[PDB]
Design a binder for this molecule. Structure first.
Ligand SMILES: CNC(=O)CN(C[C@@H](C)c1ccccc1)C(=O)c1cc(C)c(=O)n(C)c1
Length: 112
């Protein structure tokens, strides 16, 4: 019940974050940052634990997450990495803030 039900809620949130509804600001978070491709040669010196929605999806599909807290920690790690690496006035930070608003408001509706 509880753990399964809470992970169903997490899976629902994940599907929404990946949905066309949010694509305009979610797209930078779909796949791992390709630091080399973008010439971001300091990315892996600054970000020690990269995270993205494809990694969260793989972990959910593999039943890696044992509870909602573990799932939420990865989603927030993804946003934190964005806030750590990028100047706060960058468009990717505006997109991060918007997708995190979607995440936090629906995560708060967790079944007890
Ligand atoms: C499929 N391609 C992409 O997703 C390209 N981007 C986003 C783009 C707006 C961007 C490029 C270069 C520097 C900053 C932002 C990224 O790979 C990306 C995504 C995040 C969260 C991030 O924090 N960075 C630094 C980079």
């Amino acid at each position: 019940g509880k753990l399964s039900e809470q992970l169903k809620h997490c899976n629902g949130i994940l599907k929404e974050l990946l949905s066309k509804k949010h694509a305009a600001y979610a797209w930078p978070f779909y796949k791992p940052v390709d630091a080399s491709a973008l010439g971001l040669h300091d990315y892996h010196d600054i970000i020690k634990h990269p995270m993205d929605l494809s990694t969260v999806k793989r972990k959910m599909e593999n039943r890696d997450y044992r509870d909602a807290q573990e799932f939420a920690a990865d989603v927030r790690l993804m946003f934190s990495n964005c806030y750590k690496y990028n100047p706060p006035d960058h468009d990717v930070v505006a997109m991060a803030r918007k997708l995190q608003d979607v995440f936090e408001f629906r995560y708060a509706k967790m079944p007890d």
